[PDB]
């Protein structure tokens, strides 16, 4: 129902955890595109970023620390 | 005795049993009770009602420690899981927070093929 950088051209960044946390659930799981209404292309860039951020521990692999 | 104040209840609710273990905050166990320990053998062992008495028999047997309030960290699917936390709360304990620590792997090992 809502869109993103498809109209406002820009790239996803693994460092920007401000917006990256808005695309994952608080339980440390990536939310599917069927709910967020994200374009398939950006979802892939999104997922790559989430996985990179998790490696740099800027995001939880799971909320249960 | 040692008189502890706060603790945490570990509820291992699996498909056949629902072993409940009340430990302290550091993890050291104090007392425990199971569905299969209070009788209930066989088909009645894997039942939420058996989980009720498991909680009741674990509600006591920890009286000497006198736990005021405790947390609940349930684990496994089990037929209880939510009926056992009810009997533990209605027993007279103060439930601060309930958490779920079911151990789901990220495709770690190859599960069984059993059950045809």
């Amino acid at each position: 129902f809502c869109r993103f950088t498809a109209e406002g051209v820009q790239e996803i960044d693994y460092k920007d955890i401000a917006t990256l946390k808005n695309y994952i659930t608080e339980s440390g799981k990536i939310v599917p595109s069927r709910i967020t209404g994200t374009r398939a292309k950006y979802q892939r860039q999104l997922a790559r970023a989430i996985k990179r951020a998790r490696y740099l521990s800027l995001l939880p692999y799971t909320d249960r620390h | 005795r040692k008189q502890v104040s706060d603790g945490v209840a570990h509820i291992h609710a699996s498909f056949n049993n629902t072993i409940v273990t009340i430990t302290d905050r550091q993890g050291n166990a104090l007392g425990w009770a199971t569905a299969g320990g209070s009788g209930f053998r066989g088909s009645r062992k894997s039942t939420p009602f058996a989980a009720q008495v498991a909680a009741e028999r674990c509600a006591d047997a920890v009286k000497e420690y006198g736990i005021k309030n405790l947390e609940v960290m349930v684990k496994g699917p089990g037929p209880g899981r939510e009926s056992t936390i009810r009997a533990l709360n209605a027993a007279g304990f103060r439930i601060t927070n309930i958490t779920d620590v079911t151990p789901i792997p990220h495709n770690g090992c190859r599960p069984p093929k059993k059950r045809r």
């Binding site: - | 088909s43 009645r44 039942t47 009602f49």
Partner: protein, 151 residues
């Protein structure tokens, strides 16, 4: 039945006083269509109970009825696999009905002299709830509460 949910029939009260509970008790006792004998039996068992209790006739019956009156029974309602026993609550109209039958069949046991006297003995022994009729009640509860894991 399958579709028939028609109501029951209205029975007449006993010809001694207005109390259809007792009239129903007579019919449960009656065999071979001999109602004349049936009422004569329960009436004689009523005074013999009243003189052996010191209470009234009708009140000495309820205090011997709610002692053998169950609240939970066993129904065999399966889930698809094994048809395990499941405890279910009883409706009030079946409550005393199940109770009256039990004290009657207990009268068929323990042969003293005459069943008029015999059921009077069982109604008296039901007052202190320590007879074979009340035994049927607890054992039903023994398989109910001990297997009340199903709901």
């Amino acid at each position: 039945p399958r579709r028939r949910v028609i109501g029951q029939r209205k029975i007449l009260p006993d010809p001694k006083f207005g109390s259809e509970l007792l009239a129903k008790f007579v019919n449960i006792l009656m065999v071979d269509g001999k109602k004349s004998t049936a009422e004569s039996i329960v009436y004689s068992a009523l005074e013999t109970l009243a003189q052996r209790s010191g209470k009234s006739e009708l009140e000495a019956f309820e205090v011997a009825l709610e002692n053998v009156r169950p609240t939970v029974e066993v129904k065999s309602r399966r889930v698809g696999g094994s048809t395990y026993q499941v405890p279910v609550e009883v409706r009030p109209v079946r409550r005393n009905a199940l109770a009256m039958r039990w004290i009657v069949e207990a009268a068929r046991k323990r042969g003293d002299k005459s069943m008029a006297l015999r059921l009077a003995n069982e109604l008296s022994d039901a007052a202190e709830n320590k007879g074979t009729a009340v035994k049927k009640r607890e054992d039903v509860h023994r398989m109910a509460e001990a297997n009340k894991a199903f709901a």
